[PDB]
């Protein structure tokens, strides 16, 4: 009877949450209207983790939708398999963040904080456990970044003992994307350092190349990309919902993957992944899945792990198998590629097993790793930050909305010293 609220923020957070609330809706067997129509009580057992029940067959999802774009909110509420949302938890502004962390944090942020936190607590006594919060947003965005990190800060100071899954999507480090990408990225990760238990980061460029190289299907588009996003959603917290063998919930993943409280940023991966014309030519077995997880193409945070090491990693195998093969392959990875790992943590590769396979797959695997490869992303974000900050470009927006250079410089100092801990614990020997 453990509880996860999934309260989304921003345009990117709203899109990935709509994909979440449809990919688990057909997983647990719920139509777009809301009535259950599945064919197994394995779905029916732990619906309560995500869905607040109502009269009839209504299973409306417990989700504080936070946004500032009425068009985005309308598209989310009018999308297929997504009109199940209750009218109560539809808090959204009309001014909009306008791609600004400070505008989404202070002007449009703090006034919305009261109503949003009211909806959060209204869904918080309407449960039994409140095992964790799940905030999904984007680094570099306007609405999801400032309002989101303010929501981590407030929920962390008001319930200071529960897991906060920050499931954030970073944009591509190249081209330009948003003009204040390093500013919002630095500020958001600065709040995520000392207020979040655990954080997943997804890169859009890596989503592009994993949907283009292995998945093919000509252009990658966006729907398949967000389908892997929702697959990582439904794969990380599947021991909490579906029963099976050896289990690992959010707290167990946090304690097995966070050695030090600052270093809790993870790299996800979903690795059943084959194209249309190569699915009959590929035998699917746990060694094949393990090869696909540890293959660096499936990393969706960019950050090629061969330019670094692995502090810890966890694999959630979701589908019935033999754990002899899982143990064999998880040991063999360490034993042969022991140089690209850490020698001061014995057996840093972890496993969890759930029995129920996902929709249309014999077995699946979610691969999430705390590694040193993301220090490259953090240091290049800091480099772009100082490059666009030494000329004080777009400082006037943040100072008008209520920020200052002291906040900017302490955020980048926090980013730099987090890079320092990654480099130090990469170079640290056993004794």
């Amino acid at each position: 009877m453990r509880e996860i609220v999934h309260m989304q923020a921003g345009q990117c957070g709203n899109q990935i949450g709509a994909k979440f609330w449809e990919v688990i809706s057909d997983e647990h067997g719920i139509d777009p209207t809301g009535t259950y129509h599945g064919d197994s009580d394995l779905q029916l057992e732990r619906i309560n983790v995500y869905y607040n029940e109502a009269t009839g067959g209504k299973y409306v999802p417990r989700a504080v939708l936070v946004d500032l774009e009425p068009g985005t909110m309308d598209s989310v509420r009018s999308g297929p398999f997504g009109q199940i949302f209750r009218p109560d938890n539809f808090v959204f502004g009309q001014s909009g963040a306008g791609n600004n962390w400070a505008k989404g944090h202070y002007t449009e942020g703090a006034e919305l904080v009261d109503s949003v936190l009211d909806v959060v607590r209204k869904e918080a006594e309407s449960c039994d456990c409140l095992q964790g919060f799940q905030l999904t947003h984007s680094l570099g965005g306007g609405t999801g970044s400032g309002m989101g990190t303010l929501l981590i800060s407030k929920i962390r100071e008001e319930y200071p003992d529960r897991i906060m899954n920050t499931f954030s999507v970073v944009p591509s480090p190249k081209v330009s994307d948003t003009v204040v990408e390093p500013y919002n990225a630095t500020l958001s990760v600065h709040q995520l350092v000392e207020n979040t238990d655990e954080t997943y980061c997804i890169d859009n460029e890596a989503l592009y190349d994993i949907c283009f190289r292995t998945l093919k299907l000509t252009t990658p588009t966006y729907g398949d990309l967000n389908h892997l996003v929702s697959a990582t959603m439904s794969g990380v917290t599947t021991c909490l919902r579906f029963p099976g063998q050896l289990n690992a919930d959010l707290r167990k993943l946090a304690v097995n993957m966070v050695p030090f409280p600052r270093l809790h940023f993870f790299m996800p991966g979903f690795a059943p992944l084959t194209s249309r014309g190569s699915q009959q030519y590929r035998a699917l077995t746990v060694p094949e899945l393990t090869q696909q997880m540890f293959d660096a193409k499936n990393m969706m945070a960019a950050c090629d792990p061969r330019h670094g090491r692995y502090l810890t990693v966890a694999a959630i195998f979701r589908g019935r198998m033999s754990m002899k093969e899982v143990d064999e392959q998880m040991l063999n990875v360490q034993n042969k590629n022991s140089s690209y790992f850490v020698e001061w943590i014995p057996n840093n590769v972890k496993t969890a097993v759930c029995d129920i396979p996902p929709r249309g797959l014999k077995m699946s695997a979610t691969f999430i790793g705390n590694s040193t490869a993301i220090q490259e992303l953090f240091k290049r974000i800091s480099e772009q930050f100082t490059a666009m900050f030494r000329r004080k470009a777009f400082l006037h927006w943040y100072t008008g909305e209520g920020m200052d250079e002291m906040e900017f410089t302490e955020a980048e100092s926090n980013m730099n010293d987090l890079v320092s801990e990654y480099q130090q614990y990469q170079d640290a020997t056993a004794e």
């Binding site: 249309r276 699915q279 929709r359 249309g360």
Partner: peptide, 8 residues
């Protein structure tokens, strides 16, 4: 196989 045929 049924899910595969539904996919294609």
């Amino acid at each position: 196989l049924r899910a595969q045929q539904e996919a294609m």
